[PDB]
Structures are given as C-alpha cells and as structure tokens.
Structure 1
C-alpha cells in the first residue's frame, strides 16, 4: 500500500504528496496518526479531507481539527472513502462530532457497525413523491397562520435573542411527545453552553432516547463546522431509506454553515463573491438542501433557524436560503420586548400550505380574517396615540378591541419555558385553535379583560383566568 507525506502546513490547510498514479479522489478522508519519536515532538491524531488536485501528485486538503504539531514529512494514511459515520439503531441517544465519534463519554461504537459516506448524489427525478400533508405541531401561530408540510423545509428567521433556539426545543418536545417519531439534531456552529443546556434538557425530559445529536462547535476549524450538517443529514437519511420512517432534521443555524463555507473558500484562495461570500454558495446550499426530500419509502422534514445580521434580509445567506423553503417564520424583538412569545410576526410569515383545498375552507377563512384584522389595526395605532379611539368610527373601535385580544391570544406558554417562568406548557390542537379564533373574531369573548388572553393555551383557559381575576 502507498502512503503520502506532508508538504505544506499553512494553518488549517495541509498539502500532501502521494505516489504517482495513486492519488485519492476528491472528498476522500486522510488519517495522520503519529507518536513522538523524541522529546521534541508531540502525538498527533488528525484527519484531513481532500479538496483539490494541485498537480504533480500533490493534493490540497482541509483539516477537521487543529494542525499544531505537524511536521513536514509525516506519513498520511488514505482511508479510501469519504468521511463515514456510524448509523442505525446505535446512534439514538448519543452525541457525535463531525467525524461520527461519540463525545458523550458513554463508550465507543463497535467497529463492526455499518457506516455511510457523507457525500452522495441527491435523489433523482423519477423517485420523488409530491403528496402534501399538514404536520401538526401544537403551536397556535404555526398551526393557524403558517401551517407546516410533512416532507418540507421550514425556516425561522430572526435576529439575536428573539427565541429561535427555544422555539426549536419546543417544536422538538411537542412533535416527539405527540407523534412518537424519530428526530435528529445538527448543531452547526453550536455554542458549547447552549449545547450543554440542550443535552441536559433532553436528558431530563426523556426525549433523548429518540434523538441523535451532532455537535460542531465554534472552537473547531471551518471544515469541521462545514461538514456537521451533512453528517447529521447522513444520519437522518438512513431511517427513511432502509426503514421507511418519517424523520425530523433540526439544523441549528444555516448562517454559520454559510460562514464556515466562506472561511474555507478564503483559506483555499478563491476570489470572493458579492459581499465576501464564496462563489460556490448557491451550489453548496443546493447540495445541502436537495437531499432533504420526500420519497416513496419515507420523508424528511426540516426545521431550520436562520440568523439575519443587522435585520438585513438582503444578505446573501438568507437570500439564497429563501429559495428552498416551503414555509417561513419571522421573529421580532419588537414582539419579544412586549412579552408576546414566541414573538412570531403574524404578517411576515408565509406558507404554501395555507390554501383552501389543503387546510379547509373554515380554516382558510378564519386565518384570512385574522390577517385582515391585524393589517387594519396596523393603520390605527398611530392615529389612536395622537387622538383617542373615540375620534375614530364605531366599527374601528371594535376592530381595535378585537385586534388587541387576537394579538394576546396568539401567544402561548411553552413546556420549555418552565425554566424561565414556572408556568407549565400546553399543546393546542389546530381544530381547537381555529374554533377559538373564530369565536374571538365573532365577539363571543369581547367582554373579558385583555390580560386574560396573555400566555394561554386553549380558549377555555382565558375564561378561567377571567374568573380568577374577578370579572
């Protein structure tokens, strides 16, 4: 067998020279395992991924860990295949890094286990399934104004501190508890404090037994941050390919994935794109998202969180992410400051599943009425402040009277909000929430104080709160 040698070290970028005619393929993984020959050296256990073929039997590679300690001339072992990760029933309840090595300190995966390569072509045209089914989540705003589609891609856009991580945790809890399906979490560019909190929350709540978690942390090189999403996708694809399940893939942040890609491109020396991003941004995003599709055997649905820098939706990462989403959700610090969690904007959120023939005529009419009332209320807030609502017409007074209650009733208490407030969460079926909103629109509860509608689940709980306060 023939081995390589280290030619250059320039940070996280390493060049390896092989024997002529034995070059590894692009995306093949290489292994460096070295023990110190003397006191002036250190042990090295490092892996590299092939990026380019430079010519003269030389290969340009990106490292998946720290390259400190490398010496020009160390032996490099060719694995003969892309990065492979353990897969199947063994992965449930474990925490993994980018390479598929456990980090939960619970023991190693047996070496005889099946492993799959990360890089593979997307499913073909002939084998896709295009049926549309509504996915129930139990959250009022989501189930009413922006229904989710089984097998589709859903994005959550927002700035810092708006509640994306909490909302993803609540979605995981609700869907896993009420549907019993398998879920996979991919922590792309995960903060270590947040990852530890998430792991402890899952362990405490018991959801961990049905979930496999992959973590690529901020203190890791850009290649490691880049490939974690694909590792999670590879772990998720098995359950629908070999077992025909319905799986949920939660991706922590696409923005950090694009940032890692841009860092890798700049390290490789390519010419920067529009605002410094990589030229291959669209192709990378496509090769990530296009594998999340429904087929005959099974379906994967993805809930993705997006970070918008300085509220700039024109930014290339959100801009090229938008093209792949079936439903989008916009979170507002404006709503968060007022106390309305989950702080979903009821007018900026859109979904292709909000159609009369998909959700039903009553559902569609109720949602459209709610949106119209909120839109009309948006034009009276300014006038009311300068001259009170008694200046306006009689109908607009009722419009405001009902829009305040609609705004407050769009908020809900979450199970994961226990650690913040102490009030237990609730799961609201779509058939219940549509009836509640229809009743509020038609005025059956116009007499109750508006504070009774804040942080409440089903409609009867509003009446209960009004009774408690002494209406």
Structure 2
C-alpha cells in the first residue's frame, strides 16, 4: 500500500525546489519533512504536484524520497529567554550557549492588528542621533525606513539606537524600557560576529535578541527570518512592554524570495520580482504597531533597511518599502565623504508622525532649527559663489553652515535628549555664529565633556523642567561664550 494523502514522493529536485507527487491533504505554506531530515515549505499547490522549497543543502534530497506531513506548525520560540542570544531563522541557538529555555511560542506568519486595537503614536523612540530625534523623529509603534547606498552608515544608525536604550533599561521606569531585536538577512557570519561583539562591548546584548539568516543559509531561511523576529517582538507588544525591530536588510530578503518565485516558475515582473513582493513587505511592516490601553498599551517599532543602487530610490523594492513605512532616513554617498556623518539628507528625510513622537524639550528647539535649515538649503547653492552678498542671505548662509555641523556626530556614542537640546540651542540662538565652521565638531565634543563633567546639575534642570528656561538660558549663555573664546585661540 501507499498513502498519497498524508505522504508523497519527490519527482524532481534542483535549485532548492522539490516537486512532490501525492500530498493531497497538505495546506498552503505548510512545512513538510523530507526523508533525509530536511524540512520544506509547500508554496505551490498544483494539480499534479506540490512545489516545495528546500530548507538547506539539497544534495540530501533525491528522486523517490518520501516527503511526509507532520502537521508542523511553522513557529519560533518567544519570551525573555531569547534576550542576549544569537539565534538562526527558526529560533535555534547559533552562539553555542546551550538551548533556549522558551515556554511560549508564536507563529511566524500572522496578520497585523487592524484599525481598532491601535492608538496614535504618542511615545517617543529616542535613537540618540541628533539629526534623527530632532528633524526625523521616531515614535514607539512607528515604522522608520533606513535607506541609502552601500557603505553609507545604514546599520550604524540601528546600532546606536540599540546602544541608546541602555540608560532606559538600567533605570527604574518600566514605561521607557525598550527591548531590541536585530535581524540579519543575507549578511556574512564574520560581519554578524563583529556586530554582536560591538553590542556586548556596549553592554547592549542583555536586552537584545539577534536573529541571523546568513548568506550560506538557504533562501527560505532568509525569507522567513524577518517574520520569525517579528513574532518575537509581538510578544513584548502584546504583553504590555515596548519593542524595537531592525530588518537588516529587506533588499536581501526580497532577493531570497525572488529566487524561490523564479524557480517555482511564478511570473517575473519588474526586475524579475513576483507580483506579491509588495504584499510580502507590507505584511511584515504592518505588524509593527502602537497598541491602545485595552489590548495592552505596548508597542513594536520597525527600523527596516533598504540598499539602493546608485542612489536610485525609485527602484522597485525601494519604491515599495518607502510607501509602506511612516518615514524615511535617506543616506547619500556624497554627504558621507563631505564630512556629514551620519550622512542623513535633511531635505528629503521625513517623519510623518513628527512632533507627536517628541518631548517638549526637543520640540522647542527642533521646530526653530528645521525652519532655519530650510532657509539655508535654498540659499546654500550660491554660498561660495556670492562674495558681495547682502546681510539677509549672509545671516542664513552663516547660521546654516553652523547648524549643519551640529548635526554631525560620532559613532557608538548616542546622546540623551537633554544633551542634544543644549547643543542645538547653542546653534539656534546663535552663540556660535562667529566661530570658524571647520572647528564646530571638535568644539562640540569638548563642550559636551565639559557640561557633563562640571555642570551635571544643569542637565538635571533641562530634563526636569521640560525646556530651556530663562534661568538655564542665562546659565548656558555664560558657559558657551567663555568656552568659545578659549577654544578658538
């Protein structure tokens, strides 16, 4: 006898696609098990066969190999036991620190919450980077796209954001605590090894879950890896807490999914991607959400990554994830080598949530700074080609170059909100207007060490009062003008 309903046999195998005879009772996207131990997801249910994508090296799958159902729920472990563990696409540990002691589990493929379970994004998500928190502000629940060419600083923004959460997670306030999930799709292992070392060095791993589907892992593991990590973040969101997820990157995930769609012979569209590639990324990103009090009050915040090619933000996959997300942080190559680091384009970068994800301290100085940079960016094209310029434009050109230099920042040193507003305030009220533009980054680095060291009580005032008061205005005015004359000598 032969059971062709619950089991089947391989007709053809190649390029990680196994066509399977029988398997009449299998469901769509159901995980089946091959004879050699390897798993496989049933993506194409056709009349004469099942198109099964292979989860691993396909030399172990041959012709006439028995494919079996096991009623396998496609899920990954979730909880607080994953915190500080480096795991693969299915939540198996790859750090060699024993097993995961997980209790609960959640399906990788689930719908997002609808309209009713959410509430508007009120709680700010602090990155630590000044250009982001002031001009491109992100909120808990929001989905902010990090986008740019190769080697423009895309991951660095995600890393500093994770490192910035240590102060909240070490503090007593449970509302501000933000757990983190880094997801690596298509990267090499030595890059992820350096990335976990970076986080461990900053004591960040004790709250961070690292999901990693690397280049050697099969395409279906890269295809699932973002969804697996998304389910891990949803548990925190559902059970009251707040979460942050980084997809690094969705470009490489799309390539993995394209490989499967082309070898399953689904119709190739623009750039050879299938028609459901938007459906792919929109399913993922929509699951990040700000919940209301009734369902929990928690949140999941998405920071997806998209690698552009020659700055072409109009390319198919970038066009998708831009329109899905709530805002974009555009990184450019010309800005990076100009000295603008992080190399964020202020004019084009946007947060549609905006002020609603900011504190009153930041909201005071950010609106003023944003306006003056807009006045600069129009006039800046004839900054050098001017010379005989009137005092109106010379004020905008001077002030604008000063403020741009304050947006520059060091890597691996994310700042508290009270430290940022003090630095921006110096630019806005114009105490640095006569200082040499080239020496602002160095001026700021020493000034920051000075105000942290000596004036620790002054930073307490700005955080308590929720603004720079008239007392702080006068107190900070003395600290700048004296330091300015001492530094430039």
| TM bracket, shorter-chain basis | 0.7 to 0.9
Match of 2:308 in 1: 308
Q: Indicate if the aligned counterparts of 2:121 and 2:353 stay in contact, CA closer than 8 A.
A: no
Deviation (angstroms), 1:343: 1.3
Distance 1:262 1:19 in 2: 25
Matched, 1:132 2:125: no
Match of 2:41 in 1: 49
Match of 2:183 in 1: 186
What TM-score does the superposition give when structure 1 sets the normalisation length?
Answer: 0.86
Report Cα offsets for 1:370-408 as digits up to 9, x if no partner: 3443344344445343442xx111222222222221111
Distance 1:354 1:24, change over 3 A: same
What TM-score does the superposition give when structure 2 sets the normalisation length?
Answer: 0.83
The number of equivalent residue pairs is 443
Distance 2:435 2:66 in 1: 76
Matched, 1:272 2:268: yes
Distance 1:261 1:86 in 2: 23
Distance 1:153 1:183, change over 3 A: same
Match of 2:469 in 1: none
Match of 1:9 in 2: 13
- 1:135 aligns to what SS in structure 2? coil
* One of 213, 219, 230 as aligned partner of 1:233: 230
Deviation (angstroms), 1:249: 0.8
Match of 1:163 in 2: 153
Matched, 1:65 2:30: no
Deviation (angstroms), 1:436: 3.8
Report Cα offsets for 1:146-179 as digits up to 9, x if no partner: 1111111011111111111112111110024434
Distance 1:203 1:386 in 2: 49
Deviation (angstroms), 1:228: 0.6
Q: Indicate if the aligned counterparts of 1:156 and 1:328 stay in contact, CA closer than 8 A.
A: yes
Matched, 1:80 2:71: yes
Q: Indicate if the aligned counterparts of 1:183 and 1:247 stay in contact, CA closer than 8 A.
A: yes
Match of 2:335 in 1: 335
Higher mean C-alpha displacement, 185-194 vs 368-377 = 368-377
Distance 1:359 1:120, change over 3 A: closer
- 1:184 aligns to what SS in structure 2? strand
Distance 1:408 1:465, change over 3 A: farther
Match of 1:39 in 2: none
Unaligned runs of 5+ in 2: 170-176, 451-479
- 2:354 aligns to what SS in structure 1? coil
Distance 1:367 1:205, change over 3 A: closer
Distance 1:457 1:323, change over 3 A: farther
The Cα RMSD (Å) is: 2.6
- 1:167 aligns to what SS in structure 2? helix
Match of 2:432 in 1: 445
Q: Indicate if the aligned counterparts of 2:248 and 2:305 stay in contact, CA closer than 8 A.
A: yes
Distance 1:138 1:109, change over 3 A: closer
Report Cα offsets for 1:294-318 as digits up to 9, x if no partner: 2232210111222111211111111
Match of 1:290 in 2: 286
Q: Indicate if the aligned counterparts of 1:427 and 1:457 stay in contact, CA closer than 8 A.
A: no
* One of 407, 412, 421 as aligned partner of 2:409: 412
Report Cα offsets for 1:313-341 as digits up to 9, x if no partner: 11111111122222211112222112221
* One of 143, 146, 150 as aligned partner of 1:153: 143
Q: Indicate if the aligned counterparts of 2:143 and 2:325 stay in contact, CA closer than 8 A.
A: yes
Deviation (angstroms), 1:105: 1.6
Match of 2:22 in 1: 18
Deviation (angstroms), 1:131: 4.5
Distance 1:196 1:360, change over 3 A: closer
